[PDB]
Protein backbone atom coordinates (compact mmCIF):
# COMPACT_ATOMS: atom_id res chain seq x y z
CA UNK A 1 0.00 0.00 0.00
CA UNK A 2 1.80 3.11 -1.21
CA UNK A 3 3.35 5.70 0.51
CA UNK A 4 1.41 9.06 -0.56
CA UNK A 5 3.47 11.80 -1.66
CA UNK A 6 2.47 15.69 -2.31
CA UNK A 7 4.01 18.43 -3.36
CA UNK A 8 3.65 22.27 -2.20
CA UNK A 9 5.76 25.10 -4.14
CA UNK A 10 6.50 28.50 -1.43
CA UNK A 11 5.77 31.80 -2.88
CA UNK A 12 8.07 34.57 -4.00
CA UNK A 13 9.60 36.69 -1.03
CA UNK A 14 9.67 40.48 -1.01
CA UNK A 15 13.40 40.78 -3.18
CA UNK A 16 11.89 38.21 -5.77
CA UNK A 17 8.69 40.48 -6.20
CA UNK A 18 10.66 43.77 -6.53
CA UNK A 19 12.93 42.12 -9.10
CA UNK A 20 9.96 41.08 -10.90
CA UNK A 21 10.47 36.95 -11.11
CA UNK A 22 8.33 35.11 -13.18
CA UNK A 23 7.50 31.29 -12.05
CA UNK A 24 8.88 28.22 -13.28
CA UNK A 25 6.52 26.20 -11.15
CA UNK A 26 2.93 25.64 -12.63
CA UNK A 27 1.03 23.59 -10.06
CA UNK A 28 -3.09 22.02 -11.21
CA UNK A 29 -4.67 19.92 -7.86
CA UNK A 30 -7.22 18.55 -10.64
CA UNK A 31 -4.98 17.09 -12.48
CA UNK A 32 -2.29 16.94 -9.16
CA UNK A 33 0.72 17.57 -11.69
CA UNK A 34 3.53 19.69 -11.23
CA UNK A 35 4.78 21.40 -14.28
CA UNK A 36 8.42 23.11 -14.30
CA UNK A 37 9.34 25.06 -17.25
CA UNK A 38 13.06 23.71 -18.17
CA UNK A 39 14.05 25.89 -21.29
CA UNK A 40 12.67 28.10 -23.50
CA UNK A 41 11.49 31.79 -23.66
CA UNK A 42 8.07 32.75 -23.47
CA UNK A 43 6.25 30.98 -26.66
CA UNK A 44 7.91 27.86 -26.89
CA UNK A 45 9.24 25.93 -24.08
CA UNK A 46 9.75 22.53 -22.95
CA UNK A 47 8.76 21.48 -19.50
CA UNK A 48 9.18 18.35 -16.75
CA UNK A 49 5.83 17.37 -15.62
CA UNK A 50 5.05 15.12 -12.47
CA UNK A 51 1.96 13.40 -10.87
CA UNK A 52 1.56 13.14 -7.01
CA UNK A 53 -0.92 12.08 -4.77
CA UNK A 54 -1.68 15.81 -4.01
CA UNK A 55 -0.08 19.07 -5.11
CA UNK A 56 -0.52 22.54 -3.18
CA UNK A 57 0.61 25.77 -5.40
CA UNK A 58 2.20 28.73 -3.86
CA UNK A 59 -1.04 30.29 -2.46
CA UNK A 60 -1.59 27.37 -0.32
CA UNK A 61 -2.56 28.28 3.00
CA UNK A 62 -1.62 26.50 6.05
CA UNK A 63 -4.78 25.27 6.75
CA UNK A 64 -5.34 23.57 3.66
CA UNK A 65 -2.10 21.37 4.02
CA UNK A 66 -3.84 20.82 7.36
CA UNK A 67 -7.19 19.66 6.21
CA UNK A 68 -6.01 17.79 3.28
CA UNK A 69 -3.05 16.24 4.51
CA UNK A 70 -2.60 16.10 8.62
CA UNK A 71 -6.70 15.53 9.61
CA UNK A 72 -6.61 12.30 7.81
CA UNK A 73 -3.40 11.59 9.31
CA UNK A 74 -4.61 12.54 12.84
CA UNK A 75 -7.31 10.31 12.72
CA UNK A 76 -5.31 7.53 11.62
CA UNK A 77 -3.18 8.02 14.41
CA UNK A 78 -6.28 8.21 17.25
CA UNK A 79 -7.45 4.72 15.98
CA UNK A 80 -3.97 3.91 17.10
CA UNK A 81 -2.24 3.76 14.05
CA UNK A 82 1.86 4.90 13.55
CA UNK A 83 2.09 7.48 11.57
CA UNK A 84 4.87 9.67 10.01
CA UNK A 85 5.48 12.96 7.93
CA UNK A 86 8.39 14.02 6.24
CA UNK A 87 9.24 17.19 5.13
CA UNK A 88 12.01 16.73 1.84
CA UNK A 89 13.56 19.59 -0.09
CA UNK A 90 16.38 22.20 -0.67
CA UNK A 91 17.23 24.86 2.09
CA UNK A 92 14.97 27.80 1.65
CA UNK A 93 11.90 25.86 0.32
CA UNK A 94 9.39 25.55 3.14
CA UNK A 95 10.29 22.72 5.50
CA UNK A 96 10.39 23.80 8.70
CA UNK A 97 7.75 26.88 7.72
CA UNK A 98 5.67 23.85 6.64
CA UNK A 99 5.96 21.78 10.09
CA UNK A 100 6.13 24.35 12.21
CA UNK A 101 5.39 27.66 10.79
CA UNK A 102 5.98 31.18 11.78
CA UNK A 103 4.11 33.54 13.58
CA UNK A 104 2.32 36.42 12.00
CA UNK A 105 4.00 39.48 12.49
CA UNK A 106 2.69 42.29 15.37
CA UNK A 107 0.93 39.50 17.59
CA UNK A 108 -2.11 40.12 15.97
CA UNK A 109 -2.89 36.35 16.85
CA UNK A 110 -2.36 34.22 19.65
CA UNK A 111 -0.80 31.24 18.57
CA UNK A 112 -3.74 28.60 18.72
CA UNK A 113 -5.48 30.92 15.71
CA UNK A 114 -2.32 32.22 13.82
CA UNK A 115 -2.71 31.44 9.97
CA UNK A 116 0.97 31.38 9.41
CA UNK A 117 1.01 28.27 12.03
CA UNK A 118 2.51 24.77 10.73
CA UNK A 119 1.18 20.97 11.34
CA UNK A 120 3.46 20.81 14.77
CA UNK A 121 1.21 23.52 16.51
CA UNK A 122 -2.07 22.22 14.73
CA UNK A 123 -1.69 18.68 15.52
CA UNK A 124 -1.30 19.36 19.02
CA UNK A 125 -4.07 21.92 19.18
CA UNK A 126 -6.63 19.48 16.95
CA UNK A 127 -5.85 16.19 19.66
CA UNK A 128 -7.45 17.99 22.53
CA UNK A 129 -10.64 19.20 20.05
CA UNK A 130 -11.38 15.73 18.90
CA UNK A 131 -11.42 14.20 22.27
CA UNK A 132 -12.84 16.59 24.98
CA UNK A 133 -15.81 14.45 25.63
CA UNK A 134 -15.88 11.50 23.54
CA UNK A 135 -15.71 9.17 25.92
CA UNK A 136 -11.89 7.75 25.70
CA UNK A 137 -8.88 8.96 28.05
CA UNK A 138 -6.02 9.74 27.16
CA UNK A 139 -2.41 11.07 27.59
CA UNK A 140 -0.42 13.45 24.91
CA UNK A 141 3.49 12.63 25.12
CA UNK A 142 5.68 14.61 22.91
CA UNK A 143 9.16 14.43 22.31
CA UNK A 144 12.27 16.11 20.23
CA UNK A 145 14.89 14.21 18.36
CA UNK A 146 17.76 16.00 16.32
CA UNK A 147 20.14 14.69 14.39
CA UNK A 148 23.15 16.84 13.36
CA UNK A 149 26.79 14.96 11.73
CA UNK A 150 25.12 11.42 13.40
CA UNK A 151 25.44 12.66 16.84
CA UNK A 152 21.84 12.82 18.30
CA UNK A 153 20.46 16.05 20.59
CA UNK A 154 17.38 16.30 22.92
CA UNK A 155 15.75 19.70 22.19
CA UNK A 156 13.06 19.83 24.85
CA UNK A 157 15.30 18.58 27.81
CA UNK A 158 15.31 21.57 30.10
CA UNK A 159 17.30 20.09 32.59
CA UNK A 160 20.37 19.00 30.01
CA UNK A 161 22.03 22.08 27.12
CA UNK A 162 21.50 20.76 23.86
CA UNK A 163 25.78 19.96 23.93
CA UNK A 164 24.92 16.40 25.29
CA UNK A 165 24.97 13.46 22.95
CA UNK A 166 22.54 11.04 23.32
CA UNK A 167 23.00 7.05 22.83
CA UNK A 168 21.37 5.05 20.78
CA UNK A 169 20.44 1.42 21.56
CA UNK A 170 18.70 -1.81 19.60
CA UNK A 171 15.50 -2.48 21.60
CA UNK A 172 15.93 -6.21 22.73
CA UNK A 173 11.67 -6.09 23.18
CA UNK A 174 11.96 -5.05 19.73
CA UNK A 175 13.13 -6.39 16.55
CA UNK A 176 12.76 -3.62 14.59
CA UNK A 177 13.04 -0.91 16.93
CA UNK A 178 15.53 1.53 18.97
CA UNK A 179 15.73 2.99 22.51
CA UNK A 180 17.24 6.31 22.78
CA UNK A 181 18.81 6.54 26.63
CA UNK A 182 18.20 10.17 27.99
CA UNK A 183 15.68 11.40 25.32
CA UNK A 184 12.82 12.87 27.25
CA UNK A 185 9.27 12.75 26.84
CA UNK A 186 7.14 16.25 28.17
CA UNK A 187 3.45 15.42 29.58
CA UNK A 188 1.18 17.87 27.83
CA UNK A 189 -1.55 17.89 30.18
CA UNK A 190 -4.03 20.27 28.44
CA UNK A 191 -4.11 22.64 25.30
CA UNK A 192 -2.63 25.47 27.11
CA UNK A 193 0.97 23.94 27.86
CA UNK A 194 1.64 23.11 24.24
CA UNK A 195 3.09 26.77 22.97
CA UNK A 196 5.26 26.90 26.09
CA UNK A 197 6.75 23.82 25.24
CA UNK A 198 7.36 24.55 21.65
CA UNK A 199 9.07 27.61 22.77
CA UNK A 200 11.94 25.40 25.01
CA UNK A 201 12.24 23.71 22.09
CA UNK A 202 13.08 27.12 19.48
CA UNK A 203 15.00 28.23 22.31
CA UNK A 204 17.39 25.20 22.28
CA UNK A 205 17.32 25.39 18.82
CA UNK A 206 18.81 29.29 19.27
CA UNK A 207 21.80 27.72 21.19
CA UNK A 208 22.34 24.91 18.96
CA UNK A 209 23.22 27.08 16.14
CA UNK A 210 25.52 29.01 17.84
CA UNK A 211 27.08 25.98 18.67
CA UNK A 212 27.18 23.64 15.41
CA UNK A 213 28.23 24.95 11.63
CA UNK A 214 25.34 25.69 9.40
CA UNK A 215 22.83 23.52 12.14
CA UNK A 216 19.17 24.37 10.92
CA UNK A 217 19.84 23.43 7.46
CA UNK A 218 22.23 20.15 8.30
CA UNK A 219 20.33 19.00 11.11
CA UNK A 220 17.12 16.27 11.10
CA UNK A 221 14.40 17.04 13.26
CA UNK A 222 12.24 14.48 14.90
CA UNK A 223 9.07 16.00 16.74
CA UNK A 224 7.29 12.95 17.85
CA UNK A 225 3.78 12.75 19.53
CA UNK A 226 2.39 10.03 21.31
CA UNK A 227 -1.11 9.41 22.46
CA UNK A 228 -1.97 6.81 25.17
CA UNK A 229 -6.00 6.20 24.84
CA UNK A 230 -8.47 4.30 27.03
CA UNK A 231 -12.18 3.83 25.84
CA UNK A 232 -14.67 1.70 28.44
CA UNK A 233 -17.44 -0.11 26.96
CA UNK A 234 -21.04 -0.35 28.38
CA UNK A 235 -19.77 -3.56 30.19
CA UNK A 236 -16.80 -1.59 31.87
CA UNK A 237 -14.35 -3.77 29.59
CA UNK A 238 -10.92 -1.41 28.56
CA UNK A 239 -9.86 -0.77 25.21
CA UNK A 240 -6.48 0.60 24.42
CA UNK A 241 -5.34 2.31 21.56
CA UNK A 242 -1.81 3.99 21.61
CA UNK A 243 -0.75 5.78 18.10
CA UNK A 244 2.49 7.59 17.85
CA UNK A 245 3.03 10.33 14.86
CA UNK A 246 6.54 11.24 13.75
CA UNK A 247 6.85 14.60 12.02
CA UNK A 248 10.02 14.83 10.96
CA UNK A 249 12.21 17.70 9.02
CA UNK A 250 15.14 16.90 7.16
CA UNK A 251 17.94 18.22 6.40
CA UNK A 252 18.18 20.59 3.30
CA UNK A 253 18.65 18.19 -0.24
CA UNK A 254 20.97 20.40 -1.56
CA UNK A 255 24.33 19.97 -3.16
CA UNK A 256 28.02 18.58 3.44
CA UNK A 257 28.50 14.83 3.65
CA UNK A 258 25.08 13.87 5.50
CA UNK A 259 25.03 10.17 5.93
CA UNK A 260 21.34 10.16 7.20
CA UNK A 261 20.34 12.07 4.12
CA UNK A 262 22.81 9.64 1.64
CA UNK A 263 20.98 6.66 3.78
CA UNK A 264 17.69 8.30 3.09
CA UNK A 265 18.07 8.41 -0.36
CA UNK A 266 19.76 4.73 -0.19
CA UNK A 267 16.68 3.26 1.63
CA UNK A 268 14.26 4.25 -0.97
CA UNK A 269 16.26 3.24 -4.07
CA UNK A 270 16.44 -0.36 -1.85
CA UNK A 271 13.07 -0.61 -1.26
CA UNK A 272 11.20 1.10 -4.67
CA UNK A 273 14.36 -1.78 -6.92
CA UNK A 274 12.13 -4.48 -4.57
CA UNK A 275 16.22 -5.68 -3.57
CA UNK A 276 16.35 -7.46 -0.79
CA UNK A 277 18.75 -6.24 2.20
CA UNK A 278 17.48 -2.54 2.48
CA UNK A 279 20.36 -0.32 4.54
CA UNK A 280 18.87 0.97 7.32
CA UNK A 281 21.69 0.43 9.82
CA UNK A 282 24.19 2.40 7.62
CA UNK A 283 22.39 5.43 9.90
CA UNK A 284 20.90 6.72 12.87
CA UNK A 285 18.01 8.39 10.93
CA UNK A 286 16.65 5.64 8.92
CA UNK A 287 17.08 3.22 12.60
CA UNK A 288 15.02 5.46 14.18
CA UNK A 289 12.60 6.20 11.08
CA UNK A 290 12.89 2.39 10.03
CA UNK A 291 9.52 1.66 10.39
CA UNK A 292 8.40 4.30 8.29
CA UNK A 293 10.06 2.87 5.10
CA UNK A 294 8.55 0.37 4.14
CA UNK A 295 7.45 -0.79 7.31
CA UNK A 296 4.21 -1.09 9.35
CA UNK A 297 3.61 2.71 9.82
CA UNK A 298 1.39 5.02 7.61
CA UNK A 299 3.72 7.35 5.71
CA UNK A 300 3.55 11.06 4.21
CA UNK A 301 6.39 12.45 2.10
CA UNK A 302 6.06 16.47 1.82
CA UNK A 303 8.23 17.93 -0.93
CA UNK A 304 8.97 21.49 -0.93
CA UNK A 305 10.27 23.08 -3.92
CA UNK A 306 10.77 26.57 -4.93
CA UNK A 307 8.90 29.08 -7.62
CA UNK A 308 11.99 30.37 -9.10
CA UNK A 309 14.54 29.95 -12.23
CA UNK A 310 17.55 30.12 -9.85
CA UNK A 311 16.68 27.13 -8.64
CA UNK A 312 15.71 24.68 -11.40
CA UNK A 313 18.25 21.83 -10.92
CA UNK A 314 17.17 21.07 -7.23
CA UNK A 315 13.52 21.51 -8.01
CA UNK A 316 14.11 18.52 -10.33
CA UNK A 317 16.21 17.04 -8.29
CA UNK A 318 13.57 17.19 -5.28
CA UNK A 319 10.56 16.38 -7.67
CA UNK A 320 12.65 13.25 -9.02
CA UNK A 321 13.62 11.85 -5.55
CA UNK A 322 9.59 12.35 -4.50
CA UNK A 323 8.30 10.70 -7.83
CA UNK A 324 9.94 7.61 -7.40
CA UNK A 325 9.36 7.93 -3.31
CA UNK A 326 5.62 7.19 -4.61
CA UNK A 327 6.47 3.40 -5.19
CA UNK A 328 7.80 2.54 -1.40
CA UNK A 329 4.81 -0.25 -0.13
CA UNK A 330 4.41 0.35 3.76
CA UNK A 331 1.80 -2.04 5.62
CA UNK A 332 -0.15 -0.08 8.91
CA UNK A 333 -1.49 -1.45 11.85
N1 LIG B 1 4.56 28.10 1.79
C1 LIG B 1 5.05 29.32 2.18
N2 LIG B 1 4.31 30.44 2.35
C2 LIG B 1 4.85 31.61 2.76
N3 LIG B 1 6.17 31.78 3.02
C3 LIG B 1 7.03 30.72 2.89
C4 LIG B 1 6.50 29.41 2.47
N4 LIG B 1 7.51 28.53 2.39
C5 LIG B 1 8.60 29.20 2.78
N5 LIG B 1 8.32 30.47 3.09
C6 LIG B 1 9.38 31.42 3.47
O1 LIG B 1 10.57 30.94 2.80
C7 LIG B 1 11.70 31.06 3.66
C8 LIG B 1 12.38 29.71 3.78
O2 LIG B 1 11.43 28.78 4.32
P1 LIG B 1 11.87 27.75 5.47
O3 LIG B 1 10.75 27.11 6.20
O4 LIG B 1 12.98 28.32 6.29
O5 LIG B 1 12.48 26.62 4.51
P2 LIG B 1 13.50 25.46 4.92
O6 LIG B 1 13.17 24.94 6.29
O7 LIG B 1 13.09 24.50 3.84
O8 LIG B 1 14.93 25.90 4.69
C9 LIG B 1 11.18 31.54 5.01
O9 LIG B 1 11.44 32.95 5.10
C10 LIG B 1 9.69 31.31 4.95
O10 LIG B 1 9.01 32.37 5.62
C1 LIG C 1 7.48 27.79 18.86
C2 LIG C 1 7.25 28.08 17.35
C3 LIG C 1 6.91 27.12 16.40
C4 LIG C 1 6.64 25.69 16.81
O1 LIG C 1 6.07 24.98 15.77
C5 LIG C 1 7.99 25.05 17.14
C6 LIG C 1 9.17 25.77 16.95
C7 LIG C 1 10.41 25.26 17.32
C8 LIG C 1 10.43 23.98 17.84
F1 LIG C 1 11.56 23.39 18.23
C9 LIG C 1 9.27 23.24 18.01
F2 LIG C 1 9.40 22.01 18.52
C10 LIG C 1 8.03 23.76 17.67
C11 LIG C 1 6.31 27.55 15.10
C12 LIG C 1 4.83 27.99 15.56
C13 LIG C 1 4.21 27.48 16.71
C14 LIG C 1 2.92 27.84 17.13
C15 LIG C 1 2.16 28.76 16.41
C16 LIG C 1 2.77 29.29 15.28
O2 LIG C 1 2.10 30.21 14.53
C17 LIG C 1 4.07 28.94 14.89
N1 LIG C 1 6.90 28.76 14.58
C18 LIG C 1 7.28 29.65 15.55
S1 LIG C 1 7.80 31.15 15.10
N2 LIG C 1 7.43 29.36 16.87
C19 LIG C 1 7.86 30.45 17.81
MG1 LIG D 1 14.38 24.76 7.88
Redesign the pocket.
Known sequence: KNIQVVVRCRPFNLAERKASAHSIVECDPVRKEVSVRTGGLADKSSRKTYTFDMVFGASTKQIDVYRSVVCPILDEVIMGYNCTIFAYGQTGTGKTFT??????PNEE?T??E?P???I??RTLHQIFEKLTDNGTEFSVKVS?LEIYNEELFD??NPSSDVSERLQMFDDPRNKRGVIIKGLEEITVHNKDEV?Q??????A??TTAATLMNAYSSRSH?V?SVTIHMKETTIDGEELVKIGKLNLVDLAGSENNINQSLLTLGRVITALVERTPHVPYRESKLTRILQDSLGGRTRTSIIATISPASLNLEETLSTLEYAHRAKNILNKPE
Open positions: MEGERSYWEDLAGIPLLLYILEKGAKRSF
